[PDB]
Amino acid sequence: TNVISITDGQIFLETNLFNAGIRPAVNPGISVSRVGGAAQTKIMKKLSGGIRTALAQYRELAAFSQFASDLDDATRKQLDHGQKVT
Amino acid sequence: DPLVVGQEHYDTARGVQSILQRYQELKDIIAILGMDELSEEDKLVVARARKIQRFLSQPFFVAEVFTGSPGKYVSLKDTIRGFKGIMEGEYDHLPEQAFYMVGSIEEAVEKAKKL
Amino acid sequence: DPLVVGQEHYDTARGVQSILQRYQELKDIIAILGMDELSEEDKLVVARARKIQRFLSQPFFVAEVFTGSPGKYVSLKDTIRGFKGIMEGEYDHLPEQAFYMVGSIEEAVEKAKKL
Amino acid sequence: DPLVVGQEHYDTARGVQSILQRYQELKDIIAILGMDELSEEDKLVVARARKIQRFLSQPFFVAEVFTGSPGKYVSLKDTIRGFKGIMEGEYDHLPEQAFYMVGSIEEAVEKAKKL
Amino acid sequence: TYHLDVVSAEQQMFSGLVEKIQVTGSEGELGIYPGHAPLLTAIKPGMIRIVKQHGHEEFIYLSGGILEVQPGNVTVLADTAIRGQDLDEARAMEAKRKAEEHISSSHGDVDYAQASAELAKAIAQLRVIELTKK
Amino acid sequence: AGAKDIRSKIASVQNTQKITKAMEMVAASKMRKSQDRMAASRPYAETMRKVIGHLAHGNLEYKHPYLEDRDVKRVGYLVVSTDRGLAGGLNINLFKKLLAEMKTWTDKGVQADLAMIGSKGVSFFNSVGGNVVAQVTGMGDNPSLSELIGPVKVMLQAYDEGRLDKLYIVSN
């Protein structure tokens, strides 16, 4: 708690995501950098917002992944894209 | 890691870990909603994971008294081949109990025939 | 203990205890899924356990001031007979409200006539 | 509370609260079942809730470098009057974007004239 | 006048009042009139002319079905029916191509029992596609 | 167990909430798509029930067994039922009405027969221990007009040969 309060940002490494094969194990949405895009180069700053939002959509569609056979093709696209980014 | 174990062994171990993790998630769904509610892919993963779980069991020499049965020794090469065999389709058709405290994969078929 | 109380009392007590324990086991299923998912024997277990819970209620004379209804004194034989009848299903046709705060099983049936 | 802010302010705030709560309920229906399910009175509360939600926006004097629009200061009587107006169904006919970042309602009617 | 109802297992083809109609039958085509003699019959591959109020016809393909005339309100039941502009001349010409192939490609009696129905379907379409131009 | 275990339990309940919400939305999508099929099938059956209005009353009417009222000794029921659980108190509230009617006929000794569509009907009435003459399961999203014909094949052959004296359809 002390170190969480002191620092500028957190990189949460997760055991479930490490056993699941996501080797860097970084848990998005809970990991954060309060400096953000100021730290970042113009090209990376331009491109990375797509990743941010794509994984945001993927998180909610992952619950539908069990029965994603019956979904709107727009939602199906968002899910397949979240999977391929992940 | 591959620099010691080689890619063959590393890939086999990581595959087993991923399968068991996925099954640990699916088991919670099953416990309330029932296995009929799953995807057929998830049903197959649950089946093959529940097999791998039992294949990791091995009767031990020192535990002869406890198990009333003779213990088994397995080589690393045969172990790798057995887990590859369960991760693919070769033994999709054997029951779960055919793997329990067997020994090599080459005699799990024998327990299945006995079961 | 069967030696001191005798077999009928002991058997009735252990039957009541078993049904109420099984009802505790079912309540966690019922909380999430609701009762409709239960098996037709589980629904009967619940339907009898609820009546047992109501029939354990009783008006007290010192509780005449609180409840406003006359207190009841119940002989042990009436208790054993009543709970044995409920568990055997003799009263499966009465509503739950018939059993709440009645002295004896006769009073349960008389309350049931007026619901 | 009515004894502190007065009945007009209290009723206006309670109305806004109720409308936004109802809109957050109807968003669930619009997702699960779609706009066809929605009645002509429920469509009205949705259409008003969007306008109330946007009229909550306001340009700040300190944010001008972001918005590029000069800031607004809105007196309590004016904001009460605006939300009471929208709730009473006058200004129903304006576009919902006439309310966004505008200021008071007297400036929303100017924005709608050119939007 | 009188009300006509046309339905198939897939959709309701028509429903409403009509002035007169000419309909396919088992032996031959028949024209119905207001208060006509009540009858029921199966229908061979063909079509129905729906001449509504003010004299406006429309042309419905009836590949197979049954027609009912017991009440003043009449009724057509279709095992297969197609609305007159969902089909087209190109579709009936494709049916012609299919049927002319299968006539050359059917050589026994059972397979001719099927190719004859394929031909009848093609011919009924080739008929309605011409009637559609009026 | 301790707070670690309680936290794990809470995680499992949260997972259950998400899954039991996603299959609420998917179910609503199927219910509207199937409402379209119902609304398309409705006119054809309504017209058919007008057509049998002729057979119900005219001045000249030939013999036909399916129309001739017959003295009743044996009655058949076609019960449609689900392939899937979690529908709540749908199946059983139908089945108790079926059993009330079946008991009503069985009271006077009139015999009864059942033919089922759907897994839960098979299981329930095998548990009660009634007759089952014919069966079909695995209908999925929507069965074909031809793939459900077995039960009606047997029930119609039974009403033709006088094996049945009435035939019923049973559904929500």
Automatic annotation (TrEMBL), chains B, C, D:
Localization: Cell membrane; Membrane
Protein role: Produces ATP from ADP in the presence of a proton gradient across the membrane. The catalytic sites are hosted primarily by the beta subunits.
Family as reported in the entry's similarity comment: Belongs to the ATPase alpha/beta chains family. T3SS ATPase subfamily.
Descriptive protein name: ATP synthase subunit beta
UniProtKB/TrEMBL annotation, chain E:
InterPro entries in UniProt: ATP_F1_dsu/esu_C_sf, ATP_synth_F1_dsu/esu, ATP_synth_F1_dsu/esu_N, ATP_synth_F1_esu_C, ATPsynth_dsu/esu_N
Keyword Cell membrane carried by entry: yes
Residue intervals of the ATP synthase F1 complex delta/epsilon subunit N-terminal domain: 3-81
GO cellular component, one term: proton-transporting ATP synthase complex
Stretches assigned to the ATP synthase epsilon subunit C-terminal domain: 86-130
Protein topology in the membrane: Peripheral membrane protein
Subcellular localization(s) per the UniProt record: Cell membrane
Pfam family, one: ATP-synt_DE_N
UniProt KW keywords: ATP synthesis, Cell membrane, CF(1), Hydrogen ion transport, Ion transport, Membrane, Transport
Top-level taxon in the UniProt lineage: Bacteria
A single GO molecular function term of this UniProt record: ATP binding
Purpose: Produces ATP from ADP in the presence of a proton gradient across the membrane.
Quaternary structure annotation from Swiss-Prot or TrEMBL: F-type ATPases have 2 components, CF(1) - the catalytic core - and CF(0) - the membrane proton channel. CF(1) has five subunits: alpha(3), beta(3), gamma(1), delta(1), epsilon(1). CF(0) has three main subunits: a, b and c.
Alphabetized HAMAP family for the sequence: ATP_synth_epsil_bac (MF_00530)
Family: Belongs to the ATPase epsilon chain family.
UniProt-recorded name of the protein: ATP synthase epsilon chain
UniProt organism field: Escherichia coli O145:NM
Name of the gene this protein is made from: atpC
Automatic annotation (TrEMBL), chain F:
Subcellular location: Cell inner membrane; Cell membrane
Signal peptide: none
Biological process according to GO: proton motive force-driven plasma membrane ATP synthesis
One Gene Ontology term, aspect cellular component: proton-transporting ATP synthase complex
Domain of life: Bacteria
Alphabetical UniProt keywords: ATP synthesis, Cell membrane, CF(1), Hydrogen ion transport, Hydrolase, Ion transport, Membrane, Transport
UniProt GO MF annotations: ATP binding; hydrolase activity; proton-transporting ATP synthase activity, rotational mechanism
Record's bilayer topology term: Peripheral membrane protein
Function: Produces ATP from ADP in the presence of a proton gradient across the membrane. The gamma chain is believed to be important in regulating ATPase activity and the flow of protons through the CF(0) complex.
Assembly mode: F-type ATPases have 2 components, CF(1) - the catalytic core - and CF(0) - the membrane proton channel. CF(1) has five subunits: alpha(3), beta(3), gamma(1), delta(1), epsilon(1). CF(0) has three main subunits: a, b and c.
Family, per entry: Belongs to the ATPase gamma chain family.
Record's protein name: ATP synthase gamma chain
Organism: Escherichia coli
